[PDB]
Nucleic acid binder design. Structure first.
Length: 339
RNA sequence: CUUAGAAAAGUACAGCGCGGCUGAAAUCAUCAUUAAAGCGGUUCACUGCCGCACAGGCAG
């Protein structure tokens, strides 16, 4: 059982339980980990260490979303569990308008969960994106201990989210059914690394992770020759073979209330909202059964707003490169243009 | 180092019957395109013969 509320305050352009009155329940923390099936992940809390945390959905926000989202069919998505919880649909559709820069163009993931946050559906969570990037870092570190990626940028080419279902394995018969959205986003990403020299492509593609947000991210064989390292992103951007796509940025304007959220959504119905970071409800503490013996802390997902940026002249890369700032009260990946 | 680790929604199907858009019309008077202009072989493919040839063949 968890009852503790938010410990700390968040910036105005990030959403958490602190911005809304949480007295919609149905302060002690005492949970089990060894036999429980709750989720558990690891993120870097420092340049040389990681932090384990188990993001748990806050029923306050889910209710605050179910109550408001009715009569908003244009931006409402419904799901039945085992019970009907409506969430925030992402617009209507997806249109298609240092040195040593490394590219992995045209990465397609098939069957990636779109229920990033418990109160929205759409593009997969940027937390999962950063986890995939860091898994790539770990895989490439075994063959080269001096390889670090300072920051990355994500370009989306094709986005498609529709209702599907997971056929649970038999445990006799199959357990209670579950309905969750899935996505097949086609995306390309840029990497800023400190290697500062060329690396052989065979090990680079051998170390490329496949899993991405419970999906299968694989790159076409004929695009292997396009995996090359360039010293300048200005010429790197002119190089990838896809002339269509969008760049992801953060919405710095205020989104304090869900009414203001829907007001912001209705001017363009093109921006998307998904999980961007985690707000810890408990300070990092060690428990006997962690993911890898690191400090564990029950956290809560934060919903942000992803902007659309068309790269061109007079477009600073500082507005499109994301990284994990590792704040003491929350762990989130945001673009480095915000001070 | 990804609400991490895993997952087959699939089997059948006849939309069918019938139909009058019809009545009437004036597009309509007038009009100045005007002025001004080098496209240039220096030699180069000539002169004889035959044949009746506005025919067709010879040589230097």
């Amino acid at each position: 059982v968890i009852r503790t509320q938010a410990l700390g305050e968040l910036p105005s352009f990030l959403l958490s339980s602190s911005k809304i009155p949480p007295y919609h329940w149905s302060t002690t923390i005492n949970v089990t980990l060894a036999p429980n099936y709750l989720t558990q992940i690891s993120l870097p809390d420092s340049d040389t260490s990681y932090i384990s945390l188990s993001p748990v959905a806050s029923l306050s926000m889910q209710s605050h979303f179910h109550q408001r989202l009715q009569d908003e069919n244009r931006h409402s998505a419904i799901t039945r569990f085992s019970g009907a919880f409506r969430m925030l649909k992402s617009g209507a559709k997806f249109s298609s308008p240092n040195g040593s820069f490394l590219v992995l163009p045209n990465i397609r993931v098939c069957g990636a969960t779109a229920l990033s946050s418990p109160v929205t559906v759409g593009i997969p969570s940027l937390t999962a994106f950063f986890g995939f990037v860091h898994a790539f870092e770990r895989n490439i570190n075994r063959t080269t201990s001096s390889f670090r990626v300072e920051s990355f940028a994500i370009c989306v080419h094709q986005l498609h989210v529709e209702k599907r279902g997971l056929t649970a394995e038999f445990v006799i018969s199959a357990p209670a059914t579950r309905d969750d959205w899935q996505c097949d986003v086609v995306f390309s990403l840029i990497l800023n690394t400190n290697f500062a020299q060329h690396i052989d492509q065979d090990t680079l593609v051998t170390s490329l992770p496949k899993r991405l947000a419970r999906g299968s991210a694989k790159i076409a064989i004929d695009d292997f020759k396009h995996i090359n390292s360039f010293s300048t992103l200005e010429t790197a951007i002119e190089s990838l073979p896809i002339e269509a796509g969008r760049w992801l940025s953060l919405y710095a304007q205020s989104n304090n209330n869900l009414s203001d959220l829907l007001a912001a959504m209705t001017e363009d119905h093109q921006l998307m909202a998904s999980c961007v970071g985690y707000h810890l409800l408990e300070e990092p503490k060690d428990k006997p059964n962690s993911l890898r013996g690191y400090k564990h802390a029950i956290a809560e997902c934060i919903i942000g707003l992803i902007n659309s940026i068309t790269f061109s002249s007079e477009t600073d890369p500082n507005t499109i490169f994301w990284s994990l700032k590792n704040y003491q009260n929350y762990l989130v990946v945001q673009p480095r243009s915000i001070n």
